[PDB]
Design an enzyme around this catalytic site. Structure first.
Site, PDB file in Angstrom:
ATOM      1  N   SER A 130       0.773  -1.208   0.210  1.00  0.00           N
ATOM      2  CA  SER A 130      -0.011  -0.169  -0.241  1.00  0.00           C
ATOM      3  C   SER A 130       0.522   0.928  -0.298  1.00  0.00           C
ATOM      4  O   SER A 130       1.774   1.822  -0.831  1.00  0.00           O
ATOM      5  CB  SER A 130      -1.040  -0.477   0.913  1.00  0.00           C
ATOM      6  OG  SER A 130      -1.877   1.011   0.966  1.00  0.00           O
ATOM      7  N   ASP A 176      -9.608  -3.868  -5.627  1.00  0.00           N
ATOM      8  CA  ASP A 176      -9.524  -2.680  -4.432  1.00  0.00           C
ATOM      9  C   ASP A 176      -9.867  -1.946  -4.572  1.00  0.00           C
ATOM     10  O   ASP A 176      -9.995  -1.094  -5.522  1.00  0.00           O
ATOM     11  CB  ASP A 176      -7.936  -2.530  -4.951  1.00  0.00           C
ATOM     12  CG  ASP A 176      -6.789  -2.160  -4.529  1.00  0.00           C
ATOM     13  OD1 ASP A 176      -7.476  -1.068  -3.065  1.00  0.00           O
ATOM     14  OD2 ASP A 176      -5.168  -1.860  -3.712  1.00  0.00           O
ATOM     15  N   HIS A 208      -8.016  -5.380  -1.615  1.00  0.00           N
ATOM     16  CA  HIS A 208      -6.638  -3.794  -0.867  1.00  0.00           C
ATOM     17  C   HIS A 208      -5.637  -5.557  -0.255  1.00  0.00           C
ATOM     18  O   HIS A 208      -4.495  -5.184  -0.187  1.00  0.00           O
ATOM     19  CB  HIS A 208      -6.733  -2.458  -0.335  1.00  0.00           C
ATOM     20  CG  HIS A 208      -5.317  -1.992  -0.342  1.00  0.00           C
ATOM     21  ND1 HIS A 208      -4.635  -1.192  -1.795  1.00  0.00           N
ATOM     22  CD2 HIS A 208      -4.819  -1.659   0.771  1.00  0.00           C
ATOM     23  CE1 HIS A 208      -3.908  -0.906  -0.572  1.00  0.00           C
ATOM     24  NE2 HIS A 208      -4.152  -0.764   0.653  1.00  0.00           N
TER      25      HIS A 208
END
EC number: 3.1.1.74
Length: 263
Positions: A130, A176, A208
């Site tokens: 991320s 995501d 995600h």
């Protein structure tokens, strides 16, 4: 003979197993001992030898527990790996890039002699989840001496990674909603040069948070990429080129690369 080859000639089973062929030990890095990051865990092969070294960053609000499995799995294929905590959980991507660099310098200079003696400091890689993945792209752009970068479901406000000259595998997640692939992973991949070794793997049926638990596809292709580029190990090219089958009834939603990769 490539002197950096470690472990047996690879198979799909070797890379899909829950552990690689190397037994692993762990070293705690306290937040007090960590200079320029929040502490972490170093995973290292017990077998005395030299190996490449890898630093892994979590994402926003994330802790080292969100990326621990992947540190342990990669180390078990013959790497020294640090999974970090950041200085704060709210640090932005470019702060995470500096903390990755600090974690590499920690492993090389400040870890125990047991760890330092197992590192080939010339063969380094960075990964991250991320915002951590955004940090991996930022540090890769600054450090062309890194041997690989693997941004996992990366998030970054900068879409233009044309300056990156490090072999980069971006893993996206089709569903995501936090770092959507249309605005993060795919633009990042498309901005990387056509003249580098690069790949884009978009997971099918993934959020995600797919990187935060053991995942056979993420572990297989992360390790194949590190082997190919950190160890120059052309035994692993077979997994990357032409790579996993995509679309309807595939292993992944999409796979792109600049195969064949220069040796």
């Amino acid at each position: 003979a490539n002197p950096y080859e470690r472990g047996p000639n690879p198979t799909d089973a070797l890379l899909e197993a829950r552990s690689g062929p190397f037994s692993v030990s762990e070293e705690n890095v306290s937040r007090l001992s960590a200079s320029g990051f929040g502490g972490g865990t170093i995973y290292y092969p017990r077998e005395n030898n030299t190996y490449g070294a890898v630093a892994i960053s979590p994402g926003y609000t994330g802790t080292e527990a969100s990326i621990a499995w992947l540190g342990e799995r990669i180390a078990s294929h013959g790497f020294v790996v640090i999974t970090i905590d950041t200085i704060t959980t709210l640090d932005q991507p470019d702060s995470r890039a500096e903390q990755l660099n600090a974690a590499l310098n920690h492993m090389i200079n400040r870890a125990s002699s047991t760890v330092r003696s197992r590192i080939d400091s010339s063969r380094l890689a960075v990964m991250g989840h991320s915002m951590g993945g955004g940090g991996s792209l930022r540090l890769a752009s600054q450090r062309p001496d890194l041997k690989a970068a693997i941004p996992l479901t990366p998030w970054h406000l900068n879409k233009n990674w044309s300056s990156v000259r490090v072999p980069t595998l971006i893993i996206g997640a089709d569903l995501d909603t936090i770092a959507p692939v249309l605005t993060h992973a795919r633009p990042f991949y498309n901005s990387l040069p056509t003249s580098i070794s690069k790949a884009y793997l978009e997971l099918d049926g993934a959020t995600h948070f797919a990187p935060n638990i053991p995942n056979k596809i993420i572990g297989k292709y992360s390790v194949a990429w590190l082997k190919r580029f950190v160890d120059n190990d052309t035994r692993y090219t077979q997994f990357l080129c032409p790579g996993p089958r995509d679309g309807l009834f595939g292993e992944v939603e999409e796979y792109r690369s600049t195969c064949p990769f220069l040796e």
